[PDB]
Amino acid sequence: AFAVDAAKAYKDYLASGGQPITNCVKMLCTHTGTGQAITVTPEANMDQESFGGASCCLYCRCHIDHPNPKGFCDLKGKYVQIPTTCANDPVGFTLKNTVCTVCGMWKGYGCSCDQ
Amino acid sequence: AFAVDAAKAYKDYLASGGQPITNCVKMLCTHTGTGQAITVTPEANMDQESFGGASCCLYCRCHIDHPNPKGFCDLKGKYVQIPTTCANDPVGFTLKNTVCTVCGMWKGYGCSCDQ
Amino acid sequence: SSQAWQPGVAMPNLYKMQRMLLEKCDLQNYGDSATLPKGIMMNVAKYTQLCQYLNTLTLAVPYNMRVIHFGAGSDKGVAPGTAVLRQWLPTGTLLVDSDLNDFVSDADSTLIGDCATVHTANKWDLIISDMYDPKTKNVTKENDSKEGFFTYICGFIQQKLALGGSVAIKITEHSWNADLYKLMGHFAWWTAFVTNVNASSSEAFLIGCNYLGKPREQIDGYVMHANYIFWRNTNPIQLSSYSLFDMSKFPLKLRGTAVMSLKEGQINDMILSLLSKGRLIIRENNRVVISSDVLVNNENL
Amino acid sequence: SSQAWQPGVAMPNLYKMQRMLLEKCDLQNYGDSATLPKGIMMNVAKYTQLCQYLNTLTLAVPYNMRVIHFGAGSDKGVAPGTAVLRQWLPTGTLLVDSDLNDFVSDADSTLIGDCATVHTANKWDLIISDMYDPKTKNVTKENDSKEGFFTYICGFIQQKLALGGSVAIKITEHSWNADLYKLMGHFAWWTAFVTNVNASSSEAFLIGCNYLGKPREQIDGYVMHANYIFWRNTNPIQLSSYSLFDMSKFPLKLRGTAVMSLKEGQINDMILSLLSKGRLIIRENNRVVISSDVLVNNENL
Ligand SMILES: CC(=O)NCCCC[C@H](N)C(=O)N1C[C@H](O)C[C@](C)(O)[C@@H](n2cnc3c2c(=O)n(C)c(=O)n3C)C1
Ligand SMILES: CC(=O)NCCCC[C@H](N)C(=O)N1C[C@H](O)C[C@](C)(O)[C@@H](n2cnc3c2c(=O)n(C)c(=O)n3C)C1
Ligand SMILES: C[S@@+](CC[C@H](N)C(=O)[O-])C[C@H]1O[C@@H](n2cnc3c(N)ncnc32)[C@H](O)[C@@H]1O
Ligand SMILES: C[S@@+](CC[C@H](N)C(=O)[O-])C[C@H]1O[C@@H](n2cnc3c(N)ncnc32)[C@H](O)[C@@H]1O
Ligand code: NA
Ligand code: NA
Ligand code: NA
Ligand code: NA
Ligand SMILES: [Zn+2]
Ligand SMILES: [Zn+2]
Ligand SMILES: [Zn+2]
Ligand SMILES: [Zn+2]
């Protein structure tokens, strides 16, 4: 019944004042993109930065298994858009937040399906 | 500065009443062996069980990196002798205990270099 | 009745000489289970008894022996059989294992994926296979020779087993292959061995002892499997774990068997005789390099 | 002076035609650094400018393009260059990368180990290498042609690059190989390209554009490297990151270049002409399978 909870470990490490994971790979892009959360190519808008997906995945970066039963990665091989105000901690951001399955924007950072 | 502490996670999981990791590979042997902690072949004495090393390694079993800088495993490819009274939790035992570098017995379970 | 203190029972020579038709396998003690020592898994007991039986044959045991083990993972994610093989084999023996799914192992190297993706430059002294697909136990369809991983194994033996080397390949009533039986005739000796702890199962290990690289005898594989089932159908084997309690002579004795590099033309009758007796291995003695093929593809857009 | 708005500077043809002796490289602006956009790593900027320059050449861009990237890991454990390559390449492009040490990557498949252990069945449309050993920057010893991974790369190009494909191989003053320069003459066109963000370094990318599989011109590699250093020594390049701010035309245009399977005898002058223009790729179109050799050994007793 034992499984390491890396997600909770990182969350608690951040709460206690630990420095966010660094060296996430920020891409050059137009910043005139769709603003969707996770895309096949950088899609940052004016208020976002785009990063290589693998480098923003806690499981990829920590060399641990992915929480999927198939062990598949949401981010590897794609690009993740992070709000510029949150780009000091892309791993934290992707961990804590969730993508709307309807419009593809980050819930609470672009999703407007609630009106 | 962030690193998962699987050793502490397992220790805390055990403290809280979680069931020890199962399916450690117990070997058939004479039980007339040297009783040393970690050996190239099963060396259980009358008061020990011998297990395949990899299956008693928290890092091997959890698919996470080994705490060595080179990532080398103390147990993989060898056999670990566990006191019979402790054989319900070989991963816990090897994690919590330390091998005497002089005689090769478990400190406090065979080591008598202190007299 | 002495069989209960043996590690298992080998198919008696007279049954090998028959010409039976294939029947359904009906074991008297199907469903029964032997009583294992406290806390010992079936697969540890099974491999222990297999190794105890192999101790009675003329295995070549060279310095820097090379052993590969297919089907080495369990549904528990560990490798019980590999751990018994490593206990059995001399210390320092190069052990490689493989399985379709991920598992943690005591082998010196583990390859994950279908066995067909496994490639090796060098030759081996001993090949162990526990590969098995339980889907084959379909009693409602005819029982024909199977391909799949058995095709790989036959090719691997002909291409990568050293002369003088040996094999043990797990089969069952439905998991079997005619060419593999035919290939048993390319060894100095062969049998089908049933472990006493698993005697209520149609499982056996097909053992080829001392590889000769050419037919020593012609074996029809469809007939031989029918002979094997006939033997199993008419000779109940009493479940037993007795041999598990005496491990004092378990270690495979390091015979220091000689390794020689030889070419096709130089394998005369004197060499063949040495091979047949477990006194010689023929293969290069280079370093051991292995790899698994990885299929690459990009599933985006 | 317009060079500052380019992604970099390519070695001018007249310098390629010289016959200089090899000198020490002395860059006017050694030690200076360009001012990168906020939070952008040098290696992202470097690969972006390299891809911007490659956009000006006649690259073949087939459907289901195949790209392999050697030296793809950083000391940070991630793969910045691979991420830029994947941004640049059409979506769905098969991307494989490799490095000596472990790293996490956006490539479709990553192989860890010395490049010499990397094997592939299939041919590639584009080969990128950033392999580099900083130990070569030893100024106190003579500067001779280097082997090591350059030997692998030359063989990989001759054996595994599709006709019509292209390469970009990182070199420096001391990290270079004469045969690789010679091999540049087996492409329809070649250059040494210096990125504007790294112009204070003797680094360049040796680019072979549209592979022809045979010498189109004879190049002495010792002389050509001397020509390259002469150019660098006499043409200061102003550090610049200007081109990083305009990415609207960055994506490699999917030209749908035709792929054909052809045999040695059928490569006439019409085909060669098509290859030379980036209008044709010649290789099988099977599935992509890769592997890395693993050395096996048992260090017990
Ligand atoms: C005294 C009393 O009440 N006993 C009645 C209950 C007996 C229960 C036991 N499961 C049994 O013996 N049976 C009952 C079947 O009807 C006959 C059959 C199918 O041939 C048996 N059987 C033999 N070897 C078998 C199989 C078999 O299915 N399979 C799948 C095999 O692989 N093997 C090797 C199975
Ligand atoms: C106005 C004022 O006070 N400036 C004085 C301070 C200048 C500092 C700067 N580091 C420099 O230019 N130097 C000073 C050396 O004495 C001359 C030398 C060795 O040739 C220079 N240099 C040129 N290209 C170089 C190298 C070099 O070492 N290496 C290793 C190269 O790879 N390349 C490509 C290095
Ligand atoms: C009976 S289990 C063997 C368990 C293992 N020997 C042990 O000691 O517990 C059979 C194994 O064969 C493997 N197998 C079946 N078909 C295979 C194939 N085509 N290639 C590789 N492995 C295969 C399965 O994954 C399964 O784990
Ligand atoms: C300049 S770094 C490249 C970093 C990477 N391209 C990036 O985007 O940041 C050079 C790399 O080449 C690798 N390398 C050097 N020699 C090698 C060899 N013989 N085989 C494989 N990789 C090698 C080193 O491990 C090193 O990480
Ligand atoms: Na079966
Ligand atoms: Na053998
Ligand atoms: Na250098
Ligand atoms: Na190309
Ligand atoms: Zn991931
Ligand atoms: Zn939405
Ligand atoms: Zn371990
Ligand atoms: Zn001691």
Swiss-Prot record, chains C, D:
Coiled-coil annotated residue ranges, if any: none
Chain positions of LRR repeats: 19-43
Catalytic activity: a 5'-end (N(7)-methyl 5'-triphosphoguanosine)-ribonucleoside in mRNA + S-adenosyl-L-methionine = a 5'-end (N(7)-methyl 5'-triphosphoguanosine)-(2'-O-methyl-ribonucleoside) in mRNA + S-adenosyl-L-homocysteine + H(+)
Domain of life: Viruses
Residue positions of the active site: K46, D130, K170, E203
Annotated compartments: Host nucleus; Host cytoplasm
Occurrences of domain Nidovirus-type SAM-dependent 2'-O-MTase (ranges): 2-296
Subunit composition and interactions: Interacts with nsp10.
Chain's role: Methyltransferase that mediates mRNA cap 2'-O-ribose methylation to the 5'-cap structure of viral mRNAs. N7-methyl guanosine cap is a prerequisite for binding of nsp16. Therefore, it plays an essential role in cap methylation of viral mRNAs, which is essential to evade the immune system, especially when restricted by human IFIT1 and IFIT3. May disrupt host mRNA splicing in nucleus by interacting with pre-mRNA Recognition Domains of the U1 and U2 snRNAs.
Name of the protein: 2'-O-methyltransferase nsp16
